[PDB]
Amino acid sequence: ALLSFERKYRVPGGTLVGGNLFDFWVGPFYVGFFGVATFFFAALGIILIAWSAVLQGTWNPQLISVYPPALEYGLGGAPLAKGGLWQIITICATGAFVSWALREVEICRKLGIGYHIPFAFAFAILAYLTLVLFRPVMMGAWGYAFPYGIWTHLDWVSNTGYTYGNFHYNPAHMIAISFFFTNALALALHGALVLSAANPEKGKEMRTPDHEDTFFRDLVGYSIGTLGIHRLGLLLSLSAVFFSALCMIITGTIWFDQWVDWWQWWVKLPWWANIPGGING
Amino acid sequence: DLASLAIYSFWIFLAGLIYYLQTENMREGYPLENEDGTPAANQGPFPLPKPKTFILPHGRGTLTVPGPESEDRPIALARTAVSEGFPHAPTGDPMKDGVGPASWVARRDLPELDGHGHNKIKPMKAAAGFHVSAGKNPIGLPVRGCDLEIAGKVVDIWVDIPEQMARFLEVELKDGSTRLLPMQMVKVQSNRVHVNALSSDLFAGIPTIKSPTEVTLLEEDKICGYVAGGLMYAAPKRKS
Amino acid sequence: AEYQNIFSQVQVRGPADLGMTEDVNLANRSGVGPFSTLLGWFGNAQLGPIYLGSLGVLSLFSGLMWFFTIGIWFWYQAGWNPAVFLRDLFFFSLEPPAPEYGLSFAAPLKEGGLFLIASFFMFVAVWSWWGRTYLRAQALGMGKHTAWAFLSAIWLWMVLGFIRPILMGSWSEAVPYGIFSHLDWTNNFSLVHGNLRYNPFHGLSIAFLYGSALLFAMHGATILAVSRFGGERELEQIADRGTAAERAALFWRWTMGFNATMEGIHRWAIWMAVLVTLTGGIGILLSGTVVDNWYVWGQNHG
Ligand code: BCL
Ligand code: BCL
Ligand code: BCL
Ligand code: BCL
Ligand SMILES: CC[C@H]1c2cc3[nH]c4c(c3C)C(=O)[C@H](C(=O)OC)c4c3nc(cc4[nH]c(cc(n2)[C@@H]1C)c(C(C)=O)c4C)[C@@H](C)[C@@H]3CCC(=O)OC/C=C(/C)CCC[C@@H](C)CCC[C@H](C)CCCC(C)C
Ligand SMILES: CC[C@H]1c2cc3[nH]c4c(c3C)C(=O)[C@H](C(=O)OC)c4c3nc(cc4[nH]c(cc(n2)[C@@H]1C)c(C(C)=O)c4C)[C@@H](C)[C@@H]3CCC(=O)OC/C=C(\C)CCC[C@H](C)CCC[C@H](C)CCCC(C)C
Ligand SMILES: COC(C)(C)C(=O)C/C=C(\C)CC/C=C(\C)CC/C=C(\C)CCCC/C(C)=C/CC[C@H](C)CC/C=C(\C)CCC=C(C)C
Ligand SMILES: CCCCCCCCCCCC[N+](C)(C)[O-]
Ligand SMILES: CCCCCCCCCCCC[N+](C)(C)[O-]
Ligand SMILES: CCCCCCCCCCCC[N+](C)(C)[O-]
Ligand SMILES: CCCCCCCCCCCC[N+](C)(C)[O-]
Ligand SMILES: [Fe+3]
């Protein structure tokens, strides 16, 4: 079925691979070569997870867990039942994510729009790759990656963090959290603003962008503007994931001690390290 | 206990919220249609919301959605297959016809207004006090198309008054007439304005405006559609 | 190279805009601040004007009193030495009264009395600011969405420093005013309650926080992608749908099978964000009042 205004946009072209071969839709869904690649990688990955579930002796969804090879295998292959499945599923996951992005590129070309969506999504992919590929390779074993399970991946979060004490002390993690909280702040305000203009007090006419700018200047003395808030939302979000990836890439590699102790470089700066008083003297 | 009651309640609230949200997002484009324009059999499990009405500013009327919908323009395309789901090929010139990535919507043929009731966008020459405050001033630069040929020169900047931003470059062609180019589709360089979406012979085809000091929503859509359309349709003439 | 619209290529400036009048008492609006070329490459160059009425002055005054009260205490703990102040800035902390003082205000200044003073100022600062967000919208004839959304953030803040301490019977349960100490309090609160990873509201809260970034990345990128058709002029695209709104919708329909409208995406946005502190405040409120250990609670109820 089509949205009432959709037919004019469903023309041939924009594909990156295959010419017109996969240039078609299935209901609402655009296919393309990458829609086919995505299905392949996703189906295979799901099969391997099912298979992993039989060898684990449970079909319970919140018990299933696919673990990476143990540290002793380093960065080499591992028997299926002992981490090789995890290795293959990871190749499949990566294949699917990348394929999804490329399928986004083909939709962009057909529609004549900018490539910002796929670009932004690539930041999420990079975060994923940082945890299952870059950090593990740099550290020397696949075992440092997180396991594929609903609750077990959370155990890995706590166990990894606590290996360095209170993870709140990683300076890159602080910045990342700041972008996350700031992002939610900006999203709520943005949503609220536009809606407050489109849905004014009962019986009044729709407000205008000028009322939006005015509301914000009245309140805090500044309005970033309609274009600017969209650029900001984009930046905040991407920055949060960039700093997240960074906070983890440097943990276990350039820094492997307790994160609280890293802050001593500041306390023991020559010009104040020995002055009595305060908390650190 | 109390925590279990709270979480269970929360999941019920969430399901109602998603239901409300999805229905609010069906206010345009529905009901779904078959490729021939008739109502599709299967509309999905969510019903169309009760209509709501927006009172438009400056005596422009009302808008009630969902409402009866139509393209309100001819669509020059034809089927390429006997079954649903394949592409529809342009029957003439897609740029001219306004289809595909060259598509435009039949918006009102009135200019967008600011909060005071004046035209939101105006040529800089008619906007008292407005000047280029930073960056390279494009006014006076030659405009180059993707074929690397010069198609004209910049004679003005159309600015959004309320938002204080440059929205279009007004370019003059060989014949002395002008055309608007969206600021988002040009690259301002030190000795020229570069336009990747169109080759030099396609500039004349850019839709023209009625009044020389104002642009309607309908014209912005035609102009912006046509320019974006060149990324696909002027491709043969693009160099590298 | 193709232009992305992340930064403007050319800036344009005109007379300062004093804004819409509607029912705003103009005597209370300052004059226009300077224009910022720096800011103008990303958004608007204009600074000011600002509206500063009674509620605004009150809020700004309490706000500073709150900040200054914590600040002198930091000076005090630093032994008035500037070098020690800068050195140990993140380590200082204005802590709540000890558990023995319960919910009373008897606590000696140096042992939590000053904490309550700072909190009182913070309470007025924030609530007056909330009243301000409601009133500034009213004066312009706008809906109250901003005030309602702000109220969701206030809910978490209220639970953490007011409601939960009250229900537990002591001000010692409140968050301390310090950089490193409020982090330590955060880690400690989880340990003491059997690990928040077992609190279902905490996990929901996380899903909305992550969802908020996913959603704004999606939304932000969509709008820049269709800005070549005037996409960021959302109010007019709502009133009279253009090709920007149509290709924005179709991108997503073709990608994931469904789509939003230009107005509808803002409803998804406001709820995604607000649900973060809504669920969060519920999860914290229930901690130690009704549920002592989340791990324990989860082995039974679930
Ligand atoms: C949610 C669970 C915990 C908690 C867990 C964490 C964790 C974990 C982290 C923070 C981080 C921060 N938290 Mg905390 N935080 C809590 C509740 C609060 C409250 C509150 C009134 O309830 C406040 C004011 C803060 C304040 C802060 C900032 C110091 C810092 C960045 C916040 C931010 O970017 O917002 C975005 C908003 C804006 C951009 C607007 C204002 C921005 C500035 C920074 C406002 C700060 C207020 C003021 C007190 C700054 C002190 C200045 C000193 C002179 C340095 N937290 C609760 C108790 N918070 C991060 C950090 O860096 O700690 C050092 C961090 O990693
Ligand atoms: C990001 C930092 C840590 C991490 C820390 C946490 C913490 C801490 C928490 C989660 C939580 C969640 N995480 Mg995790 N998580 C990580 C990496 C991942 C990856 C991944 C491939 O990288 C995935 C798919 C998930 C998936 C999930 C969801 C099961 C759950 C809700 C997230 C959400 O709403 O997000 C935002 C996105 C949306 C709102 C869009 C909807 C996305 C849906 C819900 C994802 C479901 C997919 C899932 C069921 C598995 C796919 C199965 C295959 C199709 C077969 N996490 C890394 C290792 N994650 C929360 C939880 O409740 O777990 C029980 C939780 O508290
Ligand atoms: C006890 C645990 C420690 C701790 C240890 C860690 C550890 C360990 C990690 C973090 C990481 C993070 N922590 Mg920490 N953290 C703690 C306390 C906090 C607090 C808090 C208020 O106290 C906060 C706010 C945070 C905040 C954060 C974020 C900055 C960051 C997670 C987001 C992210 O990386 O996304 C990135 C997004 C993704 C990886 C998702 C990628 C999705 C992919 C590309 C697509 C999925 C497709 C899906 C399968 C399809 C489904 C299809 C259909 C829907 C089914 N932490 C405590 C102190 N923190 C994580 C991080 O930084 O990772 C880089 C990390 O690994
Ligand atoms: C070791 C610690 C525990 C833990 C302990 C806690 C505790 C304790 C809490 C959270 C909370 C949260 N945690 Mg946790 N958390 C852990 C692991 C994680 C992980 C992770 C990767 O595993 C993640 C992603 C998170 C993520 C999150 C958030 C979803 C949530 C806070 C939302 C928020 O926006 O607050 C930021 C927003 C606010 C605090 C509201 C502030 C509003 C006020 C009104 C602002 C005042 C401003 C003031 C006037 C200053 C002005 C300055 C300006 C310059 C003017 N946690 C581990 C397991 N987490 C909170 C919660 O909701 O849990 C249910 C909370 O209390
Ligand atoms: C829905 C969830 C999110 C959310 C939403 C949200 N927050 C909001 C709102 C909304 C919808 C508002 O409307 C409101 C706002 O008005 O935004 C602009 C607010 C807001 N959220 C704020 C911050 C904030 N929000 C946070 C969180 C979140 N808010 C969530 C993620 C956090 C976190 C993450 O910790 C913070 C820190 C404020 C910007 C604003 C409310 C401001 C307020 O209440 O003001 C108090 C008044 C004061 C004057 C305090 C002054 C204190 C000093 C630090 C001023 C500077 C001192 C100076 C440097 C000294 C000068 C020396 C002298 C000689 C002058
Ligand atoms: C960079 C900023 C943020 C962001 C942005 C972002 N995400 C995006 C996009 C953008 C712009 C998209 O365009 C794309 C999208 O289509 O959304 C609808 C996407 C998307 N983000 C998604 C999820 C997601 N994004 C997340 C995060 C974030 N996304 C950031 C916070 C998270 C987090 C926070 O956890 C999740 C869960 C998807 C909804 C969607 C991409 C969907 C997709 O890639 O489909 C291809 C894959 C499949 C159909 C399934 C493959 C199955 C595998 C082969 C096997 C399973 C393996 C897996 C590792 C299991 C893990 C189990 C877990 C319990 C750990
Ligand atoms: C440069 O030096 C000078 C002196 C000039 C300065 O001014 C420097 C000042 C600084 C160094 C100040 C530093 C301030 C901090 C670093 C601030 C950090 C604060 C936190 C991280 C706060 C986090 C959380 C706080 C919360 C959750 C507070 C909640 C408060 C309440 C909900 C209010 C409750 C009300 C109370 C209990 C009183 C009720 C009484 C009634 C009568 C109603
Ligand atoms: C903390 C978020 C909002 C605070 C920003 C308000 C800035 C105050 C501006 C003071 C200048 C005003 N004055 C006195 C000249 O009118
Ligand atoms: C199944 C019944 C669930 C009851 C709650 C349903 C959630 C309603 C969503 C809020 C409605 C929004 N609105 C229009 C007031 O903004
Ligand atoms: C967490 C968000 C979950 C999204 C769920 C929304 C349901 C999608 C249903 C849309 C079906 C509409 N359609 C194709 C009939 O138009
Ligand atoms: C408004 C958007 C709705 C998105 C809803 C996403 C919910 C994801 C499910 C998280 C499951 C959490 N848990 C463990 C706390 O129950
Ligand atoms: Fe928007």
Describe the protein in words.
The complex is a heterotrimer of chains A (about 280), B (about 240) and C (about 300). Chain A contains 9 helices and 2 strands. Chain A is mainly α. Chain A folds into 2 domains: about 1-165, Photosynthetic Reaction Center, subunit M, domain 1; about 165-265, Photosynthetic Reaction Center, subunit M, domain 1. In chain A, strands 1-2 form a two-stranded antiparallel ribbon. In chain A, strand 1 and strand 2 form a beta hairpin. In chain A, helix 3 (about 115-140) packs parallel to helix 7. With about 240 residues, chain B is α+β, with helices and mostly antiparallel strands. Chain B has 2 domains: about 1-105, Photosynthetic reaction centre, H subunit, N-terminal domain (Photosynthetic Reaction Center, Chain H, domain 1, Irregular), CATH 4.10.540; about 105-240, Photosynthetic Reaction Center, subunit H, domain 2 (Photosynthetic Reaction Center, Chain H, domain 2). Helices cover about 20% and strands about 25% of the residues of chain B. In chain B, strands 5, 7, 8, 9, 10, 11 and 12 form a 7-stranded mixed sheet that branches. Chain B is globular. Chain C folds into 2 domains: about 1-145, Up-down Bundle (Photosynthetic Reaction Center, subunit M, domain 1), CATH 1.20.85; about 145-300, Up-down Bundle (Photosynthetic Reaction Center, subunit M, domain 1). Helices cover about 55% and strands about 0% of the residues of chain C. Chain C contains 11 helices and 1 strand. The longest helix of chain C is centred in the middle third of the chain and has 26 residues, at about 115-140. Chain C is globular and about 65 Å long. The N and C termini of chain C lie far apart (about 55 Å). The chains are: A mainly alpha (about 280), B alpha+beta (about 240), C mainly alpha (about 300). Chains A and C meet through strand 2, helix 2, helix 3, helix 4 and helix 5 of A and helix 3, helix 4, helix 5, helix 6 and helix 7 of C. Strand 6 (about 130-135) of chain B pairs antiparallel with strand 1 of chain C. The structure holds bacteriochlorophyll A (4 copies), bacteriopheophytin A (2 copies), speroidenone, lauryl dimethylamine-N-oxide (4 copies) and fe (iii) ion (FE). One bacteriopheophytin A (BPH) sits at the interface of chains C and A.
